Design an enzyme around this catalytic site. Structure first.
Site, mmCIF file in Angstrom:
data_model
loop_
_atom_site.group_PDB
_atom_site.id
_atom_site.type_symbol
_atom_site.label_atom_id
_atom_site.label_comp_id
_atom_site.label_asym_id
_atom_site.label_seq_id
_atom_site.Cartn_x
_atom_site.Cartn_y
_atom_site.Cartn_z
ATOM 1 N N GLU B 265 -4.834 -17.631 14.240
ATOM 2 C CA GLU B 265 -3.744 -17.171 16.132
ATOM 3 C C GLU B 265 -2.821 -18.042 16.007
ATOM 4 O O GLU B 265 -2.942 -19.656 15.465
ATOM 5 C CB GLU B 265 -4.855 -17.695 16.706
ATOM 6 C CG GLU B 265 -4.341 -17.146 18.172
ATOM 7 C CD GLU B 265 -2.929 -15.716 18.345
ATOM 8 O OE1 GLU B 265 -3.586 -14.691 17.719
ATOM 9 O OE2 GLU B 265 -1.911 -16.492 19.029
ATOM 10 N N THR B 266 -1.488 -18.096 16.863
ATOM 11 C CA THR B 266 -0.926 -19.353 17.516
ATOM 12 C C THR B 266 -1.862 -20.437 18.798
ATOM 13 O O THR B 266 -2.598 -19.365 19.377
ATOM 14 C CB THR B 266 0.290 -18.957 18.169
ATOM 15 O OG1 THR B 266 -0.263 -17.526 19.744
ATOM 16 C CG2 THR B 266 0.839 -18.119 16.992
ATOM 17 N N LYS B 267 -1.588 -20.958 18.729
ATOM 18 C CA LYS B 267 -2.693 -22.454 19.402
ATOM 19 C C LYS B 267 -1.959 -21.817 21.146
ATOM 20 O O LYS B 267 -0.086 -21.618 21.042
ATOM 21 C CB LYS B 267 -2.183 -23.944 18.930
ATOM 22 C CG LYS B 267 -2.614 -25.038 19.489
ATOM 23 C CD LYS B 267 -4.099 -24.169 19.970
ATOM 24 C CE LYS B 267 -5.278 -25.756 19.430
ATOM 25 N NZ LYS B 267 -6.074 -24.808 18.400
ATOM 26 N N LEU B 268 -3.057 -22.079 21.861
ATOM 27 C CA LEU B 268 -2.648 -21.945 23.304
ATOM 28 C C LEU B 268 -3.240 -23.430 23.640
ATOM 29 O O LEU B 268 -4.422 -23.699 23.972
ATOM 30 C CB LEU B 268 -2.851 -20.538 23.757
ATOM 31 C CG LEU B 268 -2.616 -19.333 23.401
ATOM 32 C CD1 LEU B 268 -1.122 -19.056 23.200
ATOM 33 C CD2 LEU B 268 -2.631 -18.957 22.265
ATOM 34 N N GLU B 325 -6.616 -18.315 27.960
ATOM 35 C CA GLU B 325 -6.359 -19.519 28.128
ATOM 36 C C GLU B 325 -5.367 -19.049 29.591
ATOM 37 O O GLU B 325 -4.995 -17.944 29.334
ATOM 38 C CB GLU B 325 -5.218 -20.013 27.136
ATOM 39 C CG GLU B 325 -4.993 -21.374 27.354
ATOM 40 C CD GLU B 325 -6.027 -22.677 26.454
ATOM 41 O OE1 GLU B 325 -6.379 -22.157 27.428
ATOM 42 O OE2 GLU B 325 -5.488 -23.534 26.411
ATOM 43 N N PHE B 347 -8.163 -14.149 24.136
ATOM 44 C CA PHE B 347 -9.101 -14.398 22.405
ATOM 45 C C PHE B 347 -10.363 -13.961 22.545
ATOM 46 O O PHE B 347 -10.257 -13.524 20.924
ATOM 47 C CB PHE B 347 -8.248 -16.055 22.489
ATOM 48 C CG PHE B 347 -9.114 -16.755 22.872
ATOM 49 C CD1 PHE B 347 -10.798 -16.890 23.083
ATOM 50 C CD2 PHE B 347 -8.170 -17.770 23.382
ATOM 51 C CE1 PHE B 347 -10.850 -18.342 23.632
ATOM 52 C CE2 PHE B 347 -8.749 -18.709 24.472
ATOM 53 C CZ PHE B 347 -9.629 -19.128 24.237
ATOM 54 N N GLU B 407 2.119 -26.038 19.385
ATOM 55 C CA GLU B 407 1.619 -26.627 19.529
ATOM 56 C C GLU B 407 0.599 -26.766 18.508
ATOM 57 O O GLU B 407 1.069 -28.214 17.276
ATOM 58 C CB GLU B 407 0.496 -27.152 20.714
ATOM 59 C CG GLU B 407 -0.134 -28.278 20.618
ATOM 60 C CD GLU B 407 0.610 -29.504 21.005
ATOM 61 O OE1 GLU B 407 1.802 -30.080 20.489
ATOM 62 O OE2 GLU B 407 1.105 -29.329 22.812
ATOM 63 N N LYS B 429 -8.364 -25.904 14.255
ATOM 64 C CA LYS B 429 -6.837 -26.605 14.563
ATOM 65 C C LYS B 429 -6.084 -26.735 13.202
ATOM 66 O O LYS B 429 -6.813 -28.265 12.981
ATOM 67 C CB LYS B 429 -7.124 -26.739 16.391
ATOM 68 C CG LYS B 429 -7.779 -28.153 15.804
ATOM 69 C CD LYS B 429 -7.800 -28.256 17.287
ATOM 70 C CE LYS B 429 -6.547 -28.822 18.129
ATOM 71 N NZ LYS B 429 -7.054 -29.707 19.370
ATOM 72 N N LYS B 431 -2.641 -28.446 13.620
ATOM 73 C CA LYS B 431 -0.955 -28.756 14.395
ATOM 74 C C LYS B 431 -0.554 -29.953 13.315
ATOM 75 O O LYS B 431 -1.286 -30.859 12.502
ATOM 76 C CB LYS B 431 -2.266 -29.306 15.692
ATOM 77 C CG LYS B 431 -2.380 -31.468 15.771
ATOM 78 C CD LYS B 431 -2.550 -31.686 17.304
ATOM 79 C CE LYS B 431 -1.223 -30.794 18.273
ATOM 80 N NZ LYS B 431 -2.262 -31.291 19.890
#
Lengths: 24, 597, 81, 51, 51, 26, 23
Positions: B265-268, B325, B347, B407, B429, B431
């Site tokens: 999933e994309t980071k929020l 978020e 999420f 991010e 995570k 990044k």
């Protein structure tokens, strides 16, 4: 502590082996 | 209605805290706290023999001993500077006297009087000849006064706060005053971890506290060590800490993923929030169990999201809980932002209807999150996790996230369960900051310095850095513009080395007479150093964002000291043309290189 | 001279009590000294050191240690009359 | 000192007058005497004139 | 509170007389000044600090 | 009895540093 | 500083009125 070797602390200093020393 | 806290003088608790502080062996501290707890429990049991019910047993003790987790009362609104000013005003000390300067400038070690890092010890030293020897305050009275000051701060009243502080000072001695200062600051320095405290208090105190996030419920429920709790899980309208994704290795992901399919999933990068809806009543909690329902509204009539989310939920849903978020959305450009409208992207889901889904695997949780409501763009969103089973998929996801100025990315296992208060258990995570050779590192100079506190008391902790300006050809720059503040990225040995090297080159800075060579913005350095004598510092920052606290107008997010470059001379400082070039290269995130293996 | 020394000791002890009350702590306690009492010191000296100090033997210690004061006393006496 | 701080006007002169006939109010306890001495010192430093 | 000799006002009476004279003089000379009276050493207590 | 009776009150390795004067007197 | 009135600081203590005192 008296009689403690200055090289390895915590161990007892020992004089060099004198071998056989006949008495008077 | 008798309370144990009223029968326990504050002197005993202060002495116990001092014994804990002085003790070195963890076993000694555990023994001291255990004996104190046993004495308190024995006294409580003896006192309440006649009464067949009890309203509170040990809540005040834990509330005082753990001010960080205190939640019943709002923030006091006072800290080092304000507390020092209030103390000076109340004690009638001279405004410009040595004691006043020491209290206000507690960080400065120029006075070299005892410890110069911690405000509490300086306060103790100054108050030693003023206060009595033995106090007369009970723990109940101290708690009463503390909640009184909290309410007065919430009530916008200053005279009442001053009166309460005057009473506290009058009815306490130097040791108790120092301790109370520490607890007001919310920093006890007991040297004992929270897990140890909870374990010694009870066998399963940590899990209950994490689930409920309340020092009152844990104390009320877990009192007798013999009696335990069987069923523990997320409860309705109860704050529970969320998970935290740890650093993710970029070489053995499959090993961490068990080789099974994983969700990406994309980071929020927004505010982590938790929602509990029951019919009409909505409750919103923050990451640290801080109530935010006031801003967002507890009812659909008022708030920022409830009127828009109440109608978007399915008719068959009555009681539910979610976590997600919070961000801002722009309808003009149809994009999110790290006029604007509050937007919630969920999420995960914990409980729905009257059944608990905490133990359910992530697959069922995601299915429910896909069948929990009807998302609407701009207000309510559902994260669109993507299944993947190869390194190529995850690396492509990271590359496209970097391209989209995102991010980072998050990876989860479908079989993972929801265990609160866990660091990198099932969620990880990735990044660009976590992978080497992907940051446009920066080399800057240090022009200022602020005295440290606590552990880094008698030394230099952090410095104010500035960038040079384009000078005439063949002439080294002499005008510097402050950029940001860097405090992290160094250990004690090398930081002490840097302090020693420039110890004699430091020069005090005067606000009314700023140095000509150095130009500063809103923020100013306590001590300044001329550019000719400085060290090249390497900084790796996640991003550069506009700001107004510095002349250059830009600041680095999460700045760091990567190393010191002795070989690079001071005159090699980069210029503002470099700043604008880097800013315009991507207009935000520094990372712009594609990671290929 | 002994009385002067005792009063100077008393002044130093008053200063020392003032320093202690000023909330100042010594870096090293090995150098710490205790309060001085004239009676206690006199009794301790009389019990311990008097037998050795009062000894004259053949008279050597007098000529070794007590000549300048003798000179001054004799000069003052002759000056008086 | 608290009474002086209470007043909201501007005081050109802040003065205290002590009417006592005891030479050593704190002779038994030295700590109280030291506390009084230091408090008087800070009062004088503030600007209060004691007679 | 004691009379060392007959026909001699006690120190407390003398202090009260001095305070009254100062009050009367301030009434005329400058009525805008501020005057306060505090008693210490009495069983009863009345202070903002509740000492 | 109130709050009166319920409250009361070979390893490692050896090391050595040689310090030697460098004055002409030595 | 000398001669200051303890009642009104900043004003010198005026001497008491004497009237006429023949020499």
């Amino acid at each position: 502590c008296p009689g403690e070797s200055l090289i390895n602390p915590g161990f007892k200093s020992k004089k060099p082996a004198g071998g056989v020393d006949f008495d008077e | 209605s008798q309370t144990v806290a009223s029968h326990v003088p504050f002197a005993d608790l202060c002495s116990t805290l001092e014994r804990i502080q002085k003790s070195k062996g963890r076993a000694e501290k555990i023994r001291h706290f255990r004996e104190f707890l046993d004495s308190w429990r024995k006294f409580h049991d003896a006192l309440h023999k006649n009464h067949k019910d009890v309203t509170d047993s040990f809540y005040p003790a834990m509330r005082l001993i753990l001010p960080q987790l205190e939640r019943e009362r709002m923030a006091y609104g006072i800290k080092e500077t304000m507390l020092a000013k209030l103390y000076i005003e109340l004690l009638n000390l001279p405004r410009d006297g040595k004691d006043a300067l020491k209290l206000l400038n507690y960080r400065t070690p120029t006075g070299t009087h005892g410890d110069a890092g911690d405000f509490a010890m300086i306060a103790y030293f100054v108050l030693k000849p003023r206060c009595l020897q033995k106090g007369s305050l009970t723990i109940q009275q101290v708690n009463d006064l503390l909640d009184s000051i909290a309410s007065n701060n919430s009530a916008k009243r200053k005279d009442l706060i001053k009166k309460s502080l005057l009473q506290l000072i009058t009815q306490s001695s130097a040791l108790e005053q120092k301790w109370l200062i520490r607890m007001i600051i919310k920093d006890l320095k007991l040297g004992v971890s929270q897990q140890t405290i909870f374990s010694v208090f009870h066998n399963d105190a940590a899990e209950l506290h994490n689930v409920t996030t309340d020092l009152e419920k844990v104390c009320r429920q877990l009192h007798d060590p013999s009696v335990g709790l069987s069923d523990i899980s997320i409860t309705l309208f109860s704050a529970f800490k969320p998970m935290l994704a740890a650093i993710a290795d970029i070489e053995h992901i499959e090993k961490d993923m068990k080789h099974q399919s994983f969700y990406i999933e994309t980071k929020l990068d927004g505010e982590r929030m938790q929602m509990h809806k029951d019919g009409d009543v909505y409750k919103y909690f923050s990451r640290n169990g801080y109530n935010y329902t006031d801003q967002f509204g507890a009812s659909p009539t008022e708030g920022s999201l409830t009127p828009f989310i109440h109608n978007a939920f399915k008719a068959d849903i009555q009681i539910c809980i979610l976590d997600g978020e919070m961000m801002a959305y722009n309808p003009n450009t149809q994009t999110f932002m790290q006029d604007l409208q509050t937007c919630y992207c969920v999420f995960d889901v914990l409980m729905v209807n009257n059944k608990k889904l905490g133990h359910e695997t992530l697959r069922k949780r995601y299915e429910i999150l896909s069948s929990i409501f009807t998302p609407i763009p701009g207000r309510i969103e559902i994260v669109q996790k993507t299944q993947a089973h190869t390194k190529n998929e995850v690396i492509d996801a990271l590359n496209e996230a970097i391209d989209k100025r995102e991010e980072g990315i998050m990876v989860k296992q479908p079989l993972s369960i929801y265990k609160p208060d866990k660091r990198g258990e099932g969620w990880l995570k990735i990044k660009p900051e976590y992978v080497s050779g992907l940051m446009d590192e920066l080399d800057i100079l240090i022009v200022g310095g602020y005295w440290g506190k606590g552990s880094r008391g008698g030394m230099m902790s952090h410095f104010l850095c500035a960038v040079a300006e384009k000078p005439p050809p063949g002439e080294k720059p002499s005008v510097f513009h402050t950029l940001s503040r860097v405090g992290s990225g160094c250990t004690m040995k090398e930081l002490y080395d840097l302090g020693l090297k420039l110890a004699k080159y430091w020069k005090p800075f005067h606000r009314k007479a700023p140095p000509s060579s150095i130009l500063c913005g809103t923020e100013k350095p306590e001590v300044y150093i001329e550019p000719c004598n400085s060290v090249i510092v390497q900084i790796k920052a996640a991003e550069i964002v506009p700001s107004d606290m510095y002349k250059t107008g830009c600041t680095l997010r999460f700045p760091r000291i990567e190393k010191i470059r002795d070989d690079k001379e001071w005159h090699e400082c980069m210029t503002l043309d470099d700043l604008e070039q880097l800013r315009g290269k991507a207009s935000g995130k520094l990372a712009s290189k594609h990671l290929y293996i | 001279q002994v009385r002067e020394l005792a009063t100077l000791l008393h002044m130093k002890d008053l200063e020392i009590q003032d320093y202690q009350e000023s909330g100042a702590t010594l870096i090293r306690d090995r150098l710490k000294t205790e309060p001085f009492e004239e009676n206690s010191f006199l009794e301790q000296f009389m019990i311990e050191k008097l037998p050795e100090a009062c000894s004259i033997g053949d008279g050597k210690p007098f000529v070794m240690n007590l000549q300048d004061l003798y000179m001054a006393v004799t000069t003052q006496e002759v000056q008086v009359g | 000192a608290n009474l002086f701080s209470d007043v909201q006007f501007k005081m050109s002169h802040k003065r205290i007058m002590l009417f006592t006939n005891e030479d050593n109010p704190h002779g038994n306890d030295s700590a109280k005497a030291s506390r009084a001495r230091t408090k008087a010192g800070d009062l004088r430093d503030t600007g209060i004139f004691l007679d | 509170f004691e009379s060392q000799s007959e026909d001699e006002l006690t120190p407390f009476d003398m202090s009260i007389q001095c305070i009254q004279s100062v009050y009367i003089s301030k009434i005329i000379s400058s009525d805008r000044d501020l005057l306060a009276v505090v008693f210490y050493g009495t069983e009863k207590d009345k202070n903002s600090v509740n000492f | 009895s109130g709050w009166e009776s319920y409250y009361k009150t070979y390893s490692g390795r050896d090391s050595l540093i040689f310090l030697v004067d460098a004055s002409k007197a030595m």
